[PDB]
Amino acid sequence: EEPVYDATGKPLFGDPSEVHPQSTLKLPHDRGRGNIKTTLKNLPGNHLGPVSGIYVKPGPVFYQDYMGPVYHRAPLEFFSEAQFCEVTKRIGRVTGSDGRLYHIYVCIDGCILLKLAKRGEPRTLKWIRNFTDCPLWVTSC
């Protein structure tokens, strides 16, 4: 099971793992003045308040700051292969729970998708299950 982490950077269970050096999440980094929601077009303070980066969970729900536990790596246990989406918006580069670098997208239908950053696995993965209701910290400001 992939850990979630508190705002202090400590995992709530299990062991910590490093994020990929080329992820758009750079740690350590503070966060959590509030749970401040945003939208894809308002993706990053700004007019909505404090910004610590980009966070996303299935829904889709986006935040620009978040106080509760978050994933530092995409929990691949909760992703499944899905179909190629022709209309996507790339939002960052995330570490998978497998330690590899993925590009992360939001599809025009609202689905959160990953593609492996390195060539060789052309498939699209989709975040199917919002099991813990914790967002993924995609990028830090």
Author numbering: 21 to 64, 72 to 168
Please share excerpts from the published article on this structure.
Pestiviruses, such as bovine viral diarrhea virus (BVDV) and classical swine fever virus (CSFV) use a virally encoded protein, the N-terminal protease (Npro), to suppress the transcriptional activation of the IFN-α/β genes by interacting with IRF3 and inducing its ubiquitination and proteasome-dependent degradation. Npro has a unique ‘clam shell’-like protease fold that is distinct from other known proteins including all known proteases.
Here, we report the crystal structures of CSFV Npro and a C168A cleavage site Npro mutant to 1.6 Å resolution. The first 19 amino acids are not essential for proteolytic activity of Npro and can be deleted without affecting the in vitro protease activity. The structures presented here show that the C-terminal β-strand (one half of the product peptide) remains buried in the active site pocket, indicating that once cleaved, the C-terminus of Npro acts as an intramolecular inhibitor and thus prevents trans-activity, i.e, the enzyme is inactive toward additional substrates. Additionally, the short α-helix containing the catalytic Cys69 is disordered in the wild-type Npro structure, which may be an additional measure to deactivate the protease function after initial cleavage. In comparison, CSFV Npro structures do not have a disulfide bond between Cys69 and Cys168 because the active site-containing helix is disordered in the wild-type Npro and Cys168 is replaced in the C168A Npro. Thus, the CSFV Npro structure supports the classical cysteine protease mechanism rather than the catalytic mechanism proposed for BVDV Npro.
